[PDB]
Symmetry: T
Subunit: 106 residues, 12 copies
């Protein structure tokens, strides 16, 4: 899918995690965020469209999705041990990673 629809999936499933009361809801929402972040890792943002794909802008862009994938995988590891409150607090810390990318490329 597009980069814009992959951001629809990350935004919608993150709001379902804060309101969840069981561990099946948190575990299923974190699996869709993992698949949407891997599809968006190779894309090109509209503000870097006239650059070459070897640029230091396109190197820092791909390094930001690989930090997000490692944090989604760590929060999914807590949800499989049925630790709902620990997995919900780990997903709240995701917003500092995706505020730092919006200041540069969004």
């Amino acid at each position: 899918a597009d980069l814009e629809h992959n951001m629809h999936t990350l935004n919608d499933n993150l709001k379902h995690i804060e309101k969840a009361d069981n561990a099946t809801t948190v575990k299923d929402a974190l699996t869709k965020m993992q698949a949407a972040a891997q599809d968006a890792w190779s894309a090109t943002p509209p503000k870097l469209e006239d650059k070459s794909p070897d640029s230091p802008e396109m190197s820092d862009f791909r390094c930001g999705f690989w930090e997000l994938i490692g944090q989604i995988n760590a929060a999914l590891h807590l949800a499989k041990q049925c630790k709902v409150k620990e997995a919900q607090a780990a997903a709240e810390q995701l917003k500092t990673t995706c505020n730092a990318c919006h200041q540069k490329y969004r």
Copy 2:
């Protein structure tokens, strides 16, 4: 396979992309280039054979294949939307990545 045969697969399938007229030929050639670049990422070139596997030469070598994998994945994303001319121009830009590695390790 060897590093030498993985370079046979990348070179042969790239010449079939420039002469293709349908979107099934471009989509099938980009899938073989993706599998050959992942097998070659862990190999050791003959000009770095007497180094240790923690070297800053063996760190820049593996960083060059991971930039190529992200560009093959982006060109395969355009070919599945049946955009043949956009996927052919993205594969022409691959040659700047693999001219910069040949000056250092080939």
Copy 3:
């Protein structure tokens, strides 16, 4: 599994490689080390528990497991060609990578 049990798998299977006499034992022990290193890449060590997940400590920690995964994949490539002595000497070189991480985070 935990970070502590993933270190049990890497330590036990490495001692079986030095005493092996056939190529089926070396090839099966290197496959379990590959799966245990990928599960441990996203974890948090106890000495970095009060840091944020965007830290330059948590960036150098994940860069150390990705260097180990590339060396296990290269030694598994020699074991499938039935080169037992070359795959055993490549697994002995793994100890320099995992002595440098124990000085900083263990």
Copy 4:
């Protein structure tokens, strides 16, 4: 998933169909709408929560999702024949079915 999230999937994927330019985007969005409508067929709306599950309100509710499933299946049949404009006009006619259910149960 909930009834509320199944309505998030139907609303988001319908807006991607009107702006699509290829037949792979239309065919993939209609497949997610088919799976979200089948999961929502058995649910209970909040305005019928104090009824019994044998009611003539809960009979007309389930008859409305089965009319929608037959229209999504017919529009997916046109998209597999690469008829993009015919499948886009069939998805615009879906809004009369889901305006008649919102007047009674939403």
Copy 5:
């Protein structure tokens, strides 16, 4: 496939059931009739092409295929118990269902 080819499959396989002498022929012909009736359930006949898909004509059309699917499933249940004469007489009763639909929409 089209509505016209799905009627080719129902007509041809019904004539093979009356002339069959073993239970493997009857069981294989009833499986193709089941798959052709489910593909035709969502289609639009040419005499209802200018109606809306919420019509009481398009509601009685889909109710007629769902009565046929339940009769094919019951005759396939007798053929798996190796009751050839009971499954052949149940397939002869199918013609009253598909004479009543031809008077209205064919």
Copy 6:
């Protein structure tokens, strides 16, 4: 299987749901009731054996199993969210559906 054995499966698994204390027992008993109700939907009861398969008795018989399948699917949806008491109370409401069918066809 027969209609009589499909009623053995619905009756036995319903009594195990009222006495269950964990969510794995409720989730496994509701899956067998779903498969037994779909096999019985196409059958013919002994009190309608001399009717034709287009009758308004055989239309109300198949409409009664389709209401039961939607209630088993809704109770299985609560059991996967580990809501044991809500799924047990939804299975108690199933008895009004299957008292109304026994007054007419049993």
Copy 7:
């Protein structure tokens, strides 16, 4: 499942074998008895609950299910050769095995 429900499956499917008239009914009932006897082999009866799991009571209990599994497998071997009367008489001989266990542990 429990030990009590595994005895529900053995008792119900044995009564369907004596009344069967085709070889598909006998072959399907003997397959469910095979799966229910293997799940019950490791269980603990309520009259041996305060023993240790190394007892000579718990050794004779597990030896009785392993004699029953070999007799169900032999009767299923006759049913696949379409020998219905030989497989029905072999299932009648099962009752001497399960009268000898009820005198000691039931």
Copy 8:
């Protein structure tokens, strides 16, 4: 298959093991002997046809196949480590097990 054909498979594949020169021939012949010994474990020999299936003859018969299965599994364990001479000498020791059963039941 029959008891007589399962003895055809054990006799033919044992003579191919003594004449083999590679480890693929020994490993493939020992896999067919494992499947033929498990199918024959539940059978009834012609010299015990008029006994009951709870007899001490039918208990010593099944104990003899379970000793053979453990010896075939141990010889297959040596063949996967590419130890051809050790796996060939372990298959020669199988003949003492199957001379002791022929004196009693053949």
Copy 9:
């Protein structure tokens, strides 16, 4: 694997069961103990290396692993019902079985 490595798997996973706090850790550790006990059932201990494989020492050795497999299967049955304390106390009783084998063959 060897007999010595199968004892590494049983010893390590048993110590993780006593310190576990959730039911996913207990259920995953009991599955690895089940696979390691079945691979070790056919092996030969070093203190019985000069015996024949029909010995009454090699008959009591294989009878000891089959008692352990039935106790691991019973403790895994409690862990799937999310009964953590009952499955932890059943795994503590395993040590009497494996103290009696070490006095004779270790």
Copy 10:
């Protein structure tokens, strides 16, 4: 199926290829013709029923289906490259192969 029904499949799907307007219809009709020609290759025509299966009539009969299979495979190769007009003209040339067999054996 019979030889007569395999000729029903070849005749019906060939008339759908000349009237097709997309490449999904041509590609799906050529796949059913490939499976029907392979099932008919081993059959015996009614005009050669009293011959032996080593005859020079039964050798020229099987050589005629093997020429047809190679022409269906070549036309299916053009349809996967989305060349509809080239695949439709290749299927028109099939009629010379199946006019030459009807003059001798039909």
Copy 11:
């Protein structure tokens, strides 16, 4: 396997077909003869060992196995329709094909 063992499979399974009384025995023996004839089609007989693989002896050898494969496939087609006597008489006609090859190459 070898050419000699593939002739062991064809000879043993042909003698089980003449003595069979059900259709499951004939259908299972004809499936093993089909797999053994395809493995032997590419082999080289010992009396043609010093020829080149382009010889007119090695062309008539491969043409003889391809006539046998078509006769085994035709006899397996009768066995799936539960025609035991027709499939047994078709397997008796196989001996004329394999007497003509033994006069030239055996």
Copy 12:
């Protein structure tokens, strides 16, 4: 793929067989040559483009690929028995088959 790319696969993998030192390289190169020769069997060479597909030129063309497939299958049979020198000498004999086809159709 094209006929020209299928000749790229046969030419490249044949040169890797003469320089190989293990049996995994020879076995993997012979598997790609088998798949490329089956895709090229149905193609049309450019020097026979204006012929009809029933010609005696197009009959001798398809007979030449079927002789090559039988020689690749025989050399792959030696490589699975770990006979590297016998499989390398069998692949050298392939060049006489593909010199005789180049004199007529290339």
